[PDB]
Design a protein around this ligand. Structure first.
Ligand SMILES: [Zn+2]
Ligand SMILES: [Zn+2]
Ligand SMILES: [Zn+2]
Ligand SMILES: [Zn+2]
Ligand SMILES: [Zn+2]
Ligand SMILES: [Zn+2]
Ligand SMILES: [Zn+2]
Length: 287
């Protein structure tokens, strides 16, 4: 019954080091450390979380590992390294045995994602990660999903986790169903690969949070949850809060509640257990 928040961040805030924290995101412009996450998780009966890199650099990985060293309720860390470096194996050696369970690059920020993932040096590193049972978290915008389809097919030796369900363009759902249909087609192409699993996190901030979440936004999010459910199946879905980023749109309790309401209506008891931590535990190999 292990319950896990599979996607959250920590930071000591410095503006220049967090360029993605921009205008209208003032709520994020402060420190978010384990002490602040504690009571949020207790309130939702989540026993542990997985801390994920919030900026590029070895020092982010070192930072998260130090936090994880001292807090039992951080079960794992998804870090950052230069996966193209031939010295990757030797740079990672000091982390073997620790809570480090995977890596993520911010692929969404690359100008040509297809070219990036096909780089020989990059492919070598990802190959090395998989041979050593490291997970890789895939982070892209929905339109970039075709750009990584073949990358995912090739690297089928260990688990790949799709962050935020592929970031459906929820702010565009209002016009018509084109955005849902486009994203859903690409999602299904990735979901057909059995080594790919899906994080149900980060949806409230893909909606137009600036104007404030609306009833329609909740309905649209439910369309995406259903779609992810249909494509991946209940055993490849994991809850994640995306705290503190989620706070742009909703409180930690509202994020959890939204998922729990959907889950209780769609899923069996056993399937809920997988969503709420069983899937995270097995993909990230959590004790
Ligand atoms: Zn506590
Ligand atoms: Zn293996
Ligand atoms: Zn193969
Ligand atoms: Zn609508
Ligand atoms: Zn196909
Ligand atoms: Zn529905
Ligand atoms: Zn995030």
């Amino acid at each position: 019954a292990l319950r896990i928040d599979s996607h959250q961040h920590f930071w000591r805030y410095r503006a220049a080091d967090y360029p993605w924290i921009g205008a209208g995101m003032g709520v994020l412009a402060r420190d978010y450390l384990p002490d602040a996450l504690h009571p949020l998780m207790h309130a939702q009966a989540l026993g542990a979380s997985i801390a994920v890199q919030a900026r590029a650099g070895r020092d982010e990985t070192a930072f998260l590992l130090e936090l994880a060293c001292d807090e039992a309720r951080i079960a794992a860390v998804v870090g950052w390294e230069d996966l193209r470096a031939p010295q990757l194996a030797e740079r990672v050696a000091e982390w073997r045995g620790t809570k480090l369970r995977g890596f993520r690059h911010q692929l969404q920020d690359e100008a040509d994602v297809r070219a990036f993932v096909d780089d020989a040096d990059f492919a070598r590193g990802v190959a090395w990660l998989q041979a050593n049972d490291y997970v890789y978290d895939v982070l892209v915008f929905e339109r970039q999903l075709p750009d990584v389809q073949a990358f995912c097919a090739r690297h089928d030796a260990h688990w790949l986790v799709l962050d935020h369900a592929g970031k459906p363009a929820l702010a565009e759902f209002d016009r018509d169903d084109t955005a849902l249909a486009r994203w859903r087609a690409a999602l299904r192409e990735l979901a057909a690969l059995p080594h790919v699993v899906c994080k149900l996190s980060g949806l409230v901030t893909e909606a137009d949070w600036r104007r404030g979440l609306r009833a329609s936004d909740l309905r649209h999010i439910e369309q995406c949850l259903d779609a992810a459910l249909d494509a991946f199946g209940p055993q490849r879905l994991m809850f994640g809060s995306d705290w503190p980023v989620c706070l742009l749109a909703a409180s930690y309790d509202e994020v959890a509640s939204l998922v729990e309401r959907w889950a209780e209506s769609r899923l069996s008891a056993a399937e809920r257990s997988a969503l709420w931590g069983g899937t995270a535990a097995r993909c990230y190999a959590l004790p």
